[PDB]
Amino acid sequence: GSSGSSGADDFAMEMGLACVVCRQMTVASGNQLVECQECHNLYHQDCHKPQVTDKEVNDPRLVWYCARCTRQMKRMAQKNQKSGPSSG
C-alpha cells in the first residue's frame, strides 16, 4: 500500500500571491495585499487586524510585521528586564 502523485498544474493558487486569512488575491484601493518580514506571509490590508494603509505598504523602507509575529516577538511582556543590550 502506497499512493503517490507526480506533477502539478498551473493556476492562480500556484502564483502564491494570495493572503493567508481568506487566501485570495482580490485587491483594491485600500484593500491591497501585504507581505510580512518575519513569517513572510501575505496579509490583505483588510483581512489583517490593524487596518493597513496604502502609504504603509508603499513605504519601501518600512518593516511590516503581522500580529501573529508582533505578539510572538513580544517576550519581555512589558515586564522586568533581566538582561538585554539597549540599542537605538
In whole angstroms, how close is the CB of 12 to Zn ion at the nearest point? 13
Closest CA to 18 of 36, 38, 41: 41
Q: How far is the CB of 53 from Zn ion (least distance, A)?
A: 16
| DSSP one-letter string for 2-49 | ----------HHHH--S-SSS------TT--EEE-SSS--EEETTTSS
Q: Which is nearer to Zn ion, 8 or 64 (CB)?
A: 64
Which positions touch Zn ion (CB under 5 A)?
Answer: 19, 21-22, 24, 36, 38-39, 44, 47, 66, 69
Return the number of the residue (2 or 29) whose C-beta is nearest Zn ion: 29
